[PDB]
Design an enzyme around this catalytic site. Structure first.
Site, short mmCIF file in Angstrom:
data_model
loop_
_atom_site.label_atom_id
_atom_site.label_comp_id
_atom_site.label_asym_id
_atom_site.label_seq_id
_atom_site.Cartn_x
_atom_site.Cartn_y
_atom_site.Cartn_z
N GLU A 212 -5.07 4.70 4.84
CA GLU A 212 -4.28 3.70 4.15
C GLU A 212 -4.89 3.34 2.79
O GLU A 212 -6.08 3.05 2.70
CB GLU A 212 -4.16 2.47 5.04
N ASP A 214 -4.16 0.53 0.21
CA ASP A 214 -3.45 -0.72 -0.10
C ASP A 214 -3.51 -0.99 -1.59
O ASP A 214 -4.47 -1.59 -2.09
CB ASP A 214 -4.01 -1.89 0.71
N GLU A 217 -1.63 -6.05 -2.17
CA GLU A 217 -1.40 -7.08 -1.15
C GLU A 217 -1.57 -8.37 -1.88
O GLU A 217 -2.68 -8.67 -2.37
CB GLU A 217 -2.40 -6.98 -0.01
N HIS A 228 -8.73 2.21 2.65
CA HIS A 228 -9.17 2.25 4.06
C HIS A 228 -9.21 3.72 4.53
O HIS A 228 -8.15 4.32 4.79
CB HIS A 228 -8.19 1.51 4.98
O1 LIG Z 1 -5.13 -7.24 8.52
C1 LIG Z 1 -5.10 -8.17 7.43
C2 LIG Z 1 -5.92 -7.61 6.26
O2 LIG Z 1 -7.32 -7.48 6.61
C3 LIG Z 1 -8.13 -7.07 5.49
S1 LIG Z 1 -9.81 -6.90 6.02
C4 LIG Z 1 -7.68 -5.70 4.99
O3 LIG Z 1 -8.47 -5.34 3.85
C5 LIG Z 1 -6.21 -5.76 4.58
O4 LIG Z 1 -5.77 -4.47 4.11
C6 LIG Z 1 -5.36 -6.24 5.77
O5 LIG Z 1 -3.97 -6.38 5.39
#
Ligand SMILES: OC[C@H]1O[C@@H](S)[C@H](O)[C@@H](O)[C@@H]1O
Ligand SMILES: *[C@@H]1O[C@H](CO)[C@@H](O)[C@H](O)[C@H]1NC(C)=O
Ligand SMILES: OC[C@H]1O[C@@H](S)[C@H](O)[C@@H](O)[C@@H]1O
Ligand SMILES: OC[C@H]1O[C@@H](S)[C@H](O)[C@@H](O)[C@@H]1O
Ligand SMILES: OC[C@H]1O[C@@H](S)[C@H](O)[C@@H](O)[C@@H]1O
Ligand SMILES: OC[C@H]1O[C@H](O)[C@H](O)[C@@H](O)[C@@H]1O
Ligand SMILES: OC[C@H]1O[C@H](O)[C@H](O)[C@@H](O)[C@@H]1O
Ligand code: NI
Ligand code: NI
Length: 430
Positions: A212, A214, A217, A228
């Site tokens: 993943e 991200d 967010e 990740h």
């Molecule tokens: O699970 C919630 C959130 O935790 C954090 S630790 C992650 O980095 C993030 O990608 C995820 O959406």
């Protein structure tokens, strides 16, 4: 799962731009599809619900395989039920949509055709999009991200999945989510436990793991950029606590990294870069262009707002790292200062880069957080820590903020608007 057709499935259209070396971009006629978890599931070709509330029908679903043979996924009324609309290159995802039931948020995938997800290979390339987060208060997460999903939603590997990408099957991410009703052509009935605090969700005996990235967010208060890695690049099915993640007794007992090497400018000591209004470099009451660039040495980030380009601010007060790049140095310095070993335990940027060198599917979503109220993104977290604890402060939201029932009742007309997606080689989208 099977496919039923009492509700038609029509993927809303979404245009985006593919750019090439030279800065020439051409319009791409994409579509979006809703994730299979949001769909009505009932007996095939007709009959009783296979899942209702947060429990399975034991007659239709006595075991995982039988359930997938007897049960079908339905089409989705995107605007009326799920609060998803498109217009040209713009996608809106509303927060609370009330029709038959209260629906909260959605997860969508960008499609290349009606039966195939678009696959983006990110390394050496950049992804740009515009976003309006102005209607995202504390506790919400408008997320745009990539996952190493199969293009056909698993259909060619798992012949009991007859629904495929057309019905949003095949989700996986680095949390190895166990809330999925269908994983790899089987239902998730054996060991299923209904959620204590949510009447619509539960936790199954299986989860669905994959790499993943991200990209985004965020809400109007805070934002994070987080790779990740997983030990296997693509989708694998995990069992119980060996999924790791938030719904497991050992967060770090799986094959993926659920923490990631996260970059939140506020968490890294810049309290004036991102926020609502003219006190912030990037004003979250106005549209933001977010550009993310991937190379073997790291991930870089810049923003454009009102024609002005702002590079990612430098990490401030992070011992041993003064750059603005997610690279191996940053990720190690973050672990050293804030604690943890998950990101490097799971192969770090080298392992992430393997996923970035293969196809990943674009996910566009809006959610609130039953486990932790989005405090990890926009407040002080964990609860036992305080703003003096390294890495504890991630945004300005109150530690009492973000309880799903509360934000759903107080801010139901919240929404995220993603637009003007552009993709191509580094330097090509701007
Ligand atoms: O699970 C919630 C959130 O935790 C954090 S630790 C992650 O980095 C993030 O990608 C995820 O959406
Ligand atoms: C925060 O970022 C802005 C914009 O890049 C920069 O001008 C400012 O110096 C940064 N603040 C700190 C404390 O480093
Ligand atoms: O779970 C059953 C329920 O699912 C939801 S998703 C459908 O919209 C509704 O018509 C149906 O009664
Ligand atoms: O209400 C829409 C949709 O929501 C999800 S939570 C339900 O499981 C499904 O039956 C219906
Ligand atoms: O924000 C990064 C990471 O912080 C930890 S402390 C949270 O539990 C997780 O969800 C995420
Ligand atoms: O998994 C499906 C469920 O997803 C989210 O929790 C939505 O709020 C709910 O309406 C449905
Ligand atoms: O488990 C995840 C948590 O632990 C880490 O070591 C960090 O200090 C914290 O911010 C988070
Ligand atoms: Ni099993
Ligand atoms: Ni401050």
């Amino acid at each position: 799962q099977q496919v039923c057709t009492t509700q038609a499935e029509t993927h809303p259209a979404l245009s985006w731009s593919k750019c090439t070396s030279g800065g020439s971009c051409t319009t791409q006629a994409g579509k979006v599809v809703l994730d299979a978890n949001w769909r009505w599931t009932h007996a095939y070709p007709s009959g009783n619900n296979c899942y209702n509330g947060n429990t399975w029908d034991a007659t239709l679903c006595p075991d995982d395989a039988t359930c997938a043979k007897n049960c079908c996924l339905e089409g989705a009324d995107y605007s009326g039920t799920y609060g998803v609309t498109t217009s040209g290159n713009q996608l809106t995802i509303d927060f609370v949509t009330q029709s038959a039931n209260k629906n909260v948020g959605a997860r969508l995938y960008l499609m290349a055709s009606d039966t195939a997800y678009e696959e983006f290979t990110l390394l050496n390339n950049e992804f740009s999009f515009d976003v309006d987060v102005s209607a995202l208060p504390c506790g919400l997460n408008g997320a745009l991200y990539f996952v190493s999903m199969d293009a056909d939603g698993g259909a060619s590997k798992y012949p009991t999945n007859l629904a495929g990408a057309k019905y949003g099957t095949g989700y996986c991410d680095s949390q190895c989510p166990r809330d999925l009703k269908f994983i790899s052509g089987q239902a998730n009935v054996e060991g299923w436990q209904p959620s204590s605090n949510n009447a619509n969700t539960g936790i199954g005996g299986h989860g669905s793991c994959c790499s993943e990235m991200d990209i985004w967010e965020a809400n109007s208060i805070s934002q994070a950029l987080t790779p990740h890695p997983c030990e296997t690049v693509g989708q694998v099915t995990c069992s119980g606590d060996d999924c790791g993640g938030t719904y497991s007794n050992n967060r770090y007992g799986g094959t993926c990294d659920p923490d990631g090497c996260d970059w939140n400018p506020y968490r890294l000591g810049n309290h004036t870069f991102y926020g609502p209004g003219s006190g912030f470099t990037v004003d979250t009451t106005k549209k933001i262009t977010v550009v993310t660039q991937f190379s073997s040495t790291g991930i870089n980030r810049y923003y454009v707002q009102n024609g002005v380009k702002f590079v990612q601010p430098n990490a401030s007060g992070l011992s041993g790292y003064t750059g603005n790049t997610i690279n191996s140095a940053y990720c190690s310095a973050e672990q050293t200062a804030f604690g943890g070993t998950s990101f490097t335990d799971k192969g770090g940027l080298t392992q992430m880069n393997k996923a970035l060198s293969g196809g990943m599917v674009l996910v566009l979503s809006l959610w609130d957080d039953y486990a932790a109220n989005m405090l990890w993104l926009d407040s002080t977290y964990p609860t036992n820590d305080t703003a003096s604890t390294p890495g504890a402060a991630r945004g300005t939201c109150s530690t009492s903020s973000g309880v799903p029932a509360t934000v759903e009742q107080q801010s139901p007309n919240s929404k995220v608007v993603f637009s003007n997606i552009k993709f191509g080689p580094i330097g090509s989208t701007g």
